[PDB]
Amino acid sequence: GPLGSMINAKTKVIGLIGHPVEHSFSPIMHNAAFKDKGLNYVYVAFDVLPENLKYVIDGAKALGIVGFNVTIPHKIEIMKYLDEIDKDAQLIGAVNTIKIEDGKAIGYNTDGIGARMALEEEIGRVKDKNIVIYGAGGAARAVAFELAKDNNIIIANRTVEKAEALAKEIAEKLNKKFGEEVKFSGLDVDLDGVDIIINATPIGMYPNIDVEPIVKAEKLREDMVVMDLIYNPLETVLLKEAKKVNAKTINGLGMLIYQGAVAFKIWTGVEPNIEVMKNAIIDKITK
Amino acid sequence: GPLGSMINAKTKVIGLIGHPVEHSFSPIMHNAAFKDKGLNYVYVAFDVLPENLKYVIDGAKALGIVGFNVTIPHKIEIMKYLDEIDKDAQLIGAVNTIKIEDGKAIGYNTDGIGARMALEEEIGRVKDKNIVIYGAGGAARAVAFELAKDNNIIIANRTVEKAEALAKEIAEKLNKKFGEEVKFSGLDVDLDGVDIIINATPIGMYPNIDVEPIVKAEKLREDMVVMDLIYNPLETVLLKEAKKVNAKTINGLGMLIYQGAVAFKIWTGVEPNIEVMKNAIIDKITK
Numbered sequence A, B: 001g002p003l004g005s006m007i008n009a010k011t012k013v014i015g016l017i018g019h020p021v022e023h024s025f026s027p028i029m030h031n032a033a034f035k036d037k038g039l040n041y042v043y044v045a046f047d048v049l050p051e052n053l054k055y056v057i058d059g060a061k062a063l064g065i066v067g068f069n070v071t072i073p074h075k076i077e078i079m080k081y082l083d084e085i086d087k088d089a090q091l092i093g094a095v096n097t098i099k100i101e102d103g104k105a106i107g108y109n110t111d112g113i114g115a116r117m118a119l120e121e122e123i124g125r126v127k128d129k130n131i132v133i134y135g136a137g138g139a140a141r142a143v144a145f146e147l148a149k150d151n152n153i154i155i156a157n158r159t160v161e162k163a164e165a166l167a168k169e170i171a172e173k174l175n176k177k178f179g180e181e182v183k184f185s186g187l188d189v190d191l192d193g194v195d196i197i198i199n200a201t202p203i204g205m206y207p208n209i210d211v212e213p214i215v216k217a218e219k220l221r222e223d224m225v226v227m228d229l230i231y232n233p234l235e236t237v238l239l240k241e242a243k244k245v246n247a248k249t250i251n252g253l254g255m256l257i258y259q260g261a262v263a264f265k266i267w268t269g270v271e272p273n274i275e276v277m278k279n280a281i282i283d284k285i286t287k
Ligand SMILES: NC(=O)c1ccc[n+](C2O[C@H](COP(=O)([O-])OP(=O)(O)OC[C@H]3O[C@@H](n4cnc5c(N)ncnc54)[C@H](OP(=O)(O)O)[C@@H]3O)[C@@H](O)[C@H]2O)c1
Pocket: A114, A134, A135, A136, A137, A138, A139, A140, A157, A158, A159, A162, A199, A200, A201, A202, A203, A205, A229, A230, A231, A252, A253, A254, A255, A256, A257, A259
């Protein structure tokens, strides 16, 4: 059909709350998915200052706004304003998706599932495997809490203290063996027997793209899968290093899209077309 | 440009708050005008219950919603949640347009001005004439207050004292003579010598378009002007009753557009294109 949202008096609103948000690809992505499925919703971006976060939930309820996506710096602070919080959300300790229904605002977190789907949808079910997660920030945290449910994960980081702390919280909360199922280490850890490595750090991300990868070619193999959460540029210096060894590369586009796909489902009750989302976003990145 | 609205992460939101709002044509009017001017705004409708009205302004301020239009039944109750209210809306006692600026919510009322422009574009300056206004709601208030500035008016309503109350109030604030310049009566007031009559009541408005007109063609006259504030249908019963006496008829299209046009300017600092607003509405009303 036509390009752009065909708005009328019955159109429902969904928005992204954060500060700043003017560069999010979310609106573009979701509006295309709404059209495709013929749903009468619109996605907009709301720049919310920290002191005003306390007024959004009751405003959304009063207005009839159906839901939100939450990003920096509100995913931790928004939790005290919601009526309920999904377990998967309570575990990670952060909300990035909200649904308002029947006067009840519920928090969710799809960053975890997203990074999983980003993988499975590309290499099938991921259970009982050796997975190394470089980084320990918000991304590595959501990823880890999800892939640790049924996999052996090793959180490697520049500041080990951070790695150790995360591995303990995961083993504890998910009830796993510390030094075995949920390990930690420096960025030096070796990949002998490692099935998949996931880069959850900004190394190689624009504007510092010409820096050396999180791991040289020497430790890379073909029998591996190297996914990079970065998506600017899509093919990082890490994926190059992994291409000179026929490894199955996956760029950040996967997590970004699927993370949204699950939220879409939560708001509309319908599954969105993954290619529409990608084509809308990938077209935004390139000319 | 595109057929629908091309939303991005910078698009600003303007909404209509009221109950109900599903059959409003305002979103149609304004989005059409936004696009024609290349402005990055989207106009949507919010269904707000009277009990939740108190959470909307802080919500709007929090999210960065730049303005609203206010319709039944919040035109008066919203005044207590605003920071400032301009002269007109304060005299009139009702707010139909809001603008959030510098963390400050301001109330305006474009109804009155809208009605005069629509009436004056049709028959030239309206001054020193006898005008009857049927009704006493927010619209009647706006139009009565505005035309009472330089014309003799008579407020006719089913609830007489309610019309008496409004007449006294107008005479009071405009330094007018309660007995002559501003009168009141029931729905059967004699129209001899009356130059213009305006229907500021829902009688005849969709979907109940077969009811009895607020005044029989008996009192109508060929050299009389009959304006109905209803725009859906485009030709109410009152107007086709007026046509059977060759009287000059005017529907509510002009008031709707001119009222919106003034609000448009207020939110954006830009003057919208009238033909665009006008035709966008007609096309959604007719076929
Ligand atoms: N595709 C998607 O769906 C998606 C979703 C979310 C984020 N991303 C992104 O994911 C990546 C990760 O970041 P984040 O925002 O989640 O968290 P974050 O707060 O940026 O996490 C910081 C991480 O970066 C490390 N790090 C930073 N500079 C480093 C360097 N020069 N050398 C070694 N380690 C370094 C930190 O080790 P320390 O703590 O010790 O500094 C830590 O592990 C980013 O590149 C960003 O582009 C993609």
